[PDB]
């Protein structure tokens, strides 16, 4: 094992449009194109 | 204890004795050794109250839980 | 390079305030119902009632004076 170093239909990706409530944290999700 | 109940099962019936012994010693985690709970088959919302009471001593506990659950999304987290 | 745009929207959406959250909810409902977003575009005022003030009280702008108007038909 290498040692840890000290120094370092297809879906679109977007946010859900209609947030159901205030305070819903926007998470980038797998979204349908339409 | 009633989630997946095998009445003709000595092991699941012996877990009652272990749960009673832990409850004798004043343990708040007594349901812990039930098989459905340990396998993630059951949880209660009563744990969320314990999360709130812990926040009186651990002001970070709520934030940590939501970060694990994805409830709050901080960039770089 | 789409991740750069995703990161830009992520920081913007994280920085947005609660007023923007309430504004976009109303606008989302308005476009759903078909109403224009514009026109929806807060109350930094304090109001009270002075019943029968002394005749020396100064009149301020935007004051509303309660009146008892005599009967027009009488």
DSSP string for residues in B6-73: -SS-HHHHHHHHHHHHHHHTT-S--GGGSHHHHTTS---THHHHHHHHHTTT-TTHHHHHHHHHTSS-
- Would you state the structure tokens that stand for residue B33, as one six-digit string? 């050794």
SS3 assignment, position C14: helix
**Which residue does chain B place closest to C12, by CA atoms?**
B75
Residues of C in contact with A15 (CB under 8 A): 9, 13
Cβ–Cβ under 8 Å, residues A26 and C13: yes
PDB experimental method = cryo-EM
Tell me the C-alpha distance between A2 and C37, whole Å.
Answer: 57
In angstroms, what CA-CA distances link A13 with A21, A28, B11, C9, C41?
Answer: 21, 7, 48, 12, 31
Query: Could you tell me if A26 lies within 8 Å of chain B, comparing CB atoms?
Result: yes
Separation in Å, CA of B58 to nearest CA in chain C: 24
- Pairwise CB contact (< 8 Å): C10 & A17: no
Q: Which chain B residues are closer than 8 Å to A26 by Cβ?
A: 73
| CB pair distance less than 8 Å for C6 and A28 | yes
Distance to chain B for C28, nearest Cα, Å: 22
Listed residue (A31, B64, B70) closest to C6, CA to CA:
A31
Note the resolution in Å, 1 decimal: 2.8
Q: How close B73 comes to chain A (CA, Å)?
A: 6
Q: Could you tell me the two tokens for C19?
A: 């007023």
Put simply, the answer to whether C25 touches A22 (Cβ < 8 Å) is: yes
Which one of A18, A23, A28 has the shortest CB-CB distance to C10?
A28
Q: Contact A33/A12 with Cβ under 8 angstroms?
A: yes
Which partners does chain A have (≥3 C-beta pairs < 8 Å)?
A: B, C
């Amino acid at each position: 094992i290498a040692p840890v170093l000290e120094l370092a239909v297809e879906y679109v990706k977007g946010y859900p449009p209609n947030s159901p409530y205030i305070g819903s944290s926007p998470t980038l999700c797998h979204l349908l194109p339409v | 204890r009633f989630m997946q109940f095998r009445a003709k099962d000595s092991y699941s019936l012996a877990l009652s004795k272990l749960e009673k012994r832990e409850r004798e010693n004043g343990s708040n985690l007594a349901f812990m050794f039930r098989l459905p709970f340990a396998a993630g088959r059951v949880f209660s919302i009563s744990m969320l109250d314990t999360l709130l009471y812990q926040s009186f001593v651990k002001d970070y506990m709520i934030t940590i839980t939501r970060l694990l659950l994805g409830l709050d999304t901080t960039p770089g987290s | 390079a789409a991740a750069e745009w995703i990161s830009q929207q992520r920081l913007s959406l994280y920085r947005r305030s609660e007023r923007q959250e309430l504004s976009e909810l109303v606008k989302n409902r308005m476009k759903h119902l078909g109403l224009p977003t514009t026109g929806y575009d807060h109350q930094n005022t304090l109001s009270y009632v002075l019943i029968n003030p002394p005749p020396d009280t100064r009149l301020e702008p935007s004051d509303i004076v309660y009146l008892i108007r005599s009967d027009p038909l009488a």
